[PDB]
């Protein structure tokens, strides 16, 4: 059975910098697609950004030059990172990993981060 | 026999099939290039792999029981026989170290493409490289343990006659034996300028 | 007679080769419960590989006395 | 091709017969046999070849050349079925065949010796060893050959071979059994030569076939002369005894049937070359062995063919015919005629 | 003084004897107890039947042949021989002492043949009462038969052979023709033929029939297949009456055969106590003659010209006894001996004691060597065992095969004296190799970081892992340092471990094997100097080490190179190594990536350098003989050592990839058998648990010792020799020499000698 979970979540302080971490295990193939998505309180998700197997980067608008997403050295870890919060960035946070054709798709627990 | 039967049959059945198609135009149809150009090319390489030390490994063992049982049939009344024939059985060996050793060499060729370009130019070429070049070493190893077997046992049966015989027959194994090398060669060749999966 | 010496060996190496590993895992030593399929709990496992120790004891002593007799 | 597929079964086999090969005695070591003036010296000279220690057992004063002939001849029979011990399939079909040939000698001496009121304890230690069977000393119960066919030979692997026998008088006799024998012999080797061309692979079929050839003729040629020694035969029925499969049929043996004298018999074997010179000179049997020899010989130099082991066969036997020849010689010490042995090695 | 012919060979002299017929019998019974000289035939040329002392060979042979007919008297019985007694003339130790006078010969003759007379006509009395024994005894089985037997004259029967039986019964079907009433009975105890000493399962018969003309033919037939006939009458009083005579010659013949039976066995248990002294005597008189018929004979002097190999180191002794010899026996003589010298070819002799012994065997199974060229046995003593090990890498085996060993050297003493089963000596002949090869397999499998298939943490790894992971996260290591000895135990359990161990082993093999070949080959060159032959040395020795060096030396200076740099930090792509040499010669001149400076001029230069030692090697030896038609096997010769000179350089550096295969293969076993039955047993609780636990361990130690020991370790052991007898001795090793082989005296068996 595949897992995955998240890290990094917490409260800061009004434009300050703050990385998210995670993982996923139980699976021995690198998943094709990674990707981050939000949820404030009283809305639906919101995609953030995603990362190809081959290092291609894909960002939402809103963050677009102050978050910044990456793979890390083995395999299936990922990275999120953002340079400045603000009060609209807080919301819970969550992984996602996926498969090129079928129903394998994969989606973590979640973290939340308050400025 | 039933079996000869089966052949004709088959036969006949593919040429009424490929005269429909061709009648009825639909000639087109059986389009053997977009088969040989779709099929994943995993398939040729790791077939070829398989092959090539399965073959070689049928030829040396071949030769073995060829030369061996002739060896022990001969040595009952001249167990002298025994300690210096091995050679024959050397020879016949080695067949399939060179078939582990092209193992070794094809089998850094087997990274994994992305899918973007797994039917591209480069890639298709290792594979049908590996495949051919794979025959060719697992057939002519597997042709070379046969001839130097036959020779290891009419060695073995001379030898036991008088012991000056040996070193005349012994020339012929060389030459059988260069077969080997030969196979070897041009395996190396014809898959030396094939790239690594991309 | 030969018909003790086997299972007096078999029974020696029992001992000493049962106990070490008891030991190992007593002490959660890394080649033994490091990894995620290991067993979760060193001491629980210790302790029945450590019985198992004790039964071959017993075989060593009652097949050497009938060999030394 | 050839070897690929021999050794799965007979690998062994050719070795260890190519073994016995080596042991055949050469020109060299007849010669030193020729130089012995007793066989208790024989016996002595014998023991370095081959043949080792196989008289070990023999008092000096029980020496005689029925003796050595008979421990030199047990010699071969141990080694012939010890080979087809090992053997399975169509190579252990191949060495009964060979084997059918003497029990059908045994059966006609058996009731030669029966129909002269013979003890049958006397018979049966001249009886070949090789051609043994079961039931072999019951054809000493009657002389009816209808009575002894239903009692007896319906049981053995002989019984094809009486398709043409039965049309006898009630009552056999030394002549009318010797028309059953070679009327056996005729069925014989044409079913050997049948078998061999169905079963056997190259090389070893044309080997044979020319082989089981040679002593087709042979059979042939030693008919025609002793039918000679008869008032009469009706050519019609010698015709039958003469079998199908030889270099000399069907042209030379037509003539050689209708033939009438020694004048004759020449005139028609004047036509075939392989044996263009054999009746002006020397003695006419010794020219038969000579030539079977140059046969064995030749087969030899093939590999990885089963009619090695006839070859054998028939070369080990030539030489206790030499061996017992000088034997002979040393005993009755006539010994100008000494240097008559046969051997190419 | 002794020199140590263990190096080379011990040196050879040649002497010839001149002793007097008078003293010759007592003189070469003192050579026989020497066992130090090998004599050679002088007169090879004259008929065995020629030979001068054929008739007092024939003498002593008759009497072997009885004193073999004696002995299977014996074992025809019960009776057994009294044994021992083996070291009453020599401990072996070649001590002097005096043989048996010719009266006592003569006796033994005249008492063997005396003892045949009698067994003979004893024997054969003996048996003739037994076929009457026999013969009443399955009569009265018949008449014992019960009625109902003879309910349904008005029959025929008797005894037959139980195989036979099937037969009689369709032959007298078929001549019946279908009118047959048959009834058969069998009988519980084999019974024995004395024409065959080989026992039957008989069977009784009988039929019915009233017309006199059938039942002469029945009789007929069952005589036929050696049935025995009996006479019976109908009614039951004459059956009564005649049960009753049987009986009493019966109960009479049983006096006949205990009085003469008891009479023979007492004769056999006298020559019994003798006979094998007898034959150890007789024995010893045949060969002292054989040597002697070897000799020349002298008409024109009483005197005898023999001629024998001694080793010139022991030559002192031969001549101090055989003046004890004229001390004993006062004849006066002259000189006996003279040393001579000859263009002969003398034998090989090499000293071994309890520790050498197992691995010379191990050479002279191969070939005797050639006279003082250099003896493979010492390089074998390390190189075997090692080459062994290498492969058969791991502590755990190796410490219970060393443990077999120390069981079986500590011992020795008393295991020498016991008989010995065929497989175990073979074991106990190896004692020492065993052991050697057991406790160079713990030093190896340390540097392989395994026992049993599990690592060893002593020193601390070179290898740090990350901080902080979460359970289940992959994770990789950076490096620290290097490990002091052997293998880094961070490798273990590592999923991409086996990329990095076969990277090890396989450039472990092809050094080793490098090494081995070029060790063994300066050997050659040791010959060479010592033979003063210097065409040799610029015809063979200095063109095969250029081209054997400016190969496979070059490629094994390239992997032992590129370890000592530091690619990564360097910034350069590390070359790959099956390219380069491919390139070397498939395409010269030409580099993918660079090794070294230069790299491309000197890659080039060595091909040329490799190329033109070939006619070098080919043209320069024959050359130099048609300076001075026989000088076309010279030519001949040379060119089949060229051809194959070149092609087995490549094949025997490519077969010792084998030491990296058998090590691979050793190891995953190992894996799997712990994984598959120690593993499981982790998993159970409580008193289940532990009879799971007591129950697998057997499972595990069984397997382990049954394959992964005797089986691996022979596959393994075997596999040592073949790099011995092929790869490596083949560069520097002769062979075809002449084994040293002393006439002596021995114990015979006297179950050999009649087998």
Redo the contacts between chains.
Sequence with gaps: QVQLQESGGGLVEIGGSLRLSCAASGTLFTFNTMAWYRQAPGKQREFIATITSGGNTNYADSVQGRFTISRGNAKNTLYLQMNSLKPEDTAVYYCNARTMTGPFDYWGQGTQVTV | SFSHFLYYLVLIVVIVYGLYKLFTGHGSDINFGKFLLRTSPYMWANLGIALCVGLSVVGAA?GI??TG??????????PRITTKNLISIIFCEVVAIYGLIIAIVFSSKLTVATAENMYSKSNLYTGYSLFWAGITVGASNLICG?AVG?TG??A??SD??DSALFVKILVIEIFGSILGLLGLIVGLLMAGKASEFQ | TGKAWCCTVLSAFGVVILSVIAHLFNTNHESFVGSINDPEDGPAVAHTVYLAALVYLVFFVFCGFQVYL | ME??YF??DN??????V??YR??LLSNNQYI?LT??DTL??LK??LS?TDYGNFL??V??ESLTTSLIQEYASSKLYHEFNYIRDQSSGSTRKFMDYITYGYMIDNVALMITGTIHDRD?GEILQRCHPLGWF??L??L???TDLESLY???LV?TPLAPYFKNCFDTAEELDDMNIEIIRNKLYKAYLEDFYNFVTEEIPEPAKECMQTLLGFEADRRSINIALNSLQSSDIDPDLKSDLLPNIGKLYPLATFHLAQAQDFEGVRAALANVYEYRGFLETGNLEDHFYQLEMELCRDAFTQ?FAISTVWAWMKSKEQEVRNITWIAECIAQNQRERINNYISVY | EKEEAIFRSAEMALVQFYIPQEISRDSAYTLGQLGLVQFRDLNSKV???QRTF?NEI?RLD?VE?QY?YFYSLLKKHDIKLYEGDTDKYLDGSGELYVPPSGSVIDDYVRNASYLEERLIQMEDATDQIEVQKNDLEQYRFILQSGDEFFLKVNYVTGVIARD?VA?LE??LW??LRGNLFFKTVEIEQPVYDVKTREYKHKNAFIVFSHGDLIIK?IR??AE??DANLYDVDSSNEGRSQQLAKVNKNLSDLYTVLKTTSTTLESELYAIAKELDSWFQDVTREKAIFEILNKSNYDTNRKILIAEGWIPRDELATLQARLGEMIARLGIDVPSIIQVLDTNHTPPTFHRTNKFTAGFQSICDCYGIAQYREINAGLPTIVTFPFMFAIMFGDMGHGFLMTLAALSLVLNEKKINKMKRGEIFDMAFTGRYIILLMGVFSMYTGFLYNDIFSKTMTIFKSGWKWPDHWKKGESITATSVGTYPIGLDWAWHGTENALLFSNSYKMKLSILMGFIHMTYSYFFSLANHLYFNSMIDIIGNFIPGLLFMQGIFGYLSVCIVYKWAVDWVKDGKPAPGLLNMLINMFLSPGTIDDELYPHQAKVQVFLLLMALVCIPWLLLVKPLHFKFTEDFGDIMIHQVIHTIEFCLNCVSHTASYLRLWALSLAHAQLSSVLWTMTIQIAFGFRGFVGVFMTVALFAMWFALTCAVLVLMEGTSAMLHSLRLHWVESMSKFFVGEGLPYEPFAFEYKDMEVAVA
């Design positions: 071949w029981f060829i049982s002739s060896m022990i049939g001969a040595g009952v009344r001249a046969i036959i046992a009419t073995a049966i036991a006659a | 070897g690929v050794n799965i690998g062994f086999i050719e070795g260890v190519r073994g080596n042991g030193n130089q012995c208790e010296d002595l000279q370095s070990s057992s008092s000096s049958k079961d039931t000393p019951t000493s119960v009657a239903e009692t007896v049981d590999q | 008929r065995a039947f054929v024939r008759n042949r073999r036979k037969t369709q032959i078929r001549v033919r007929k037939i036929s297949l």
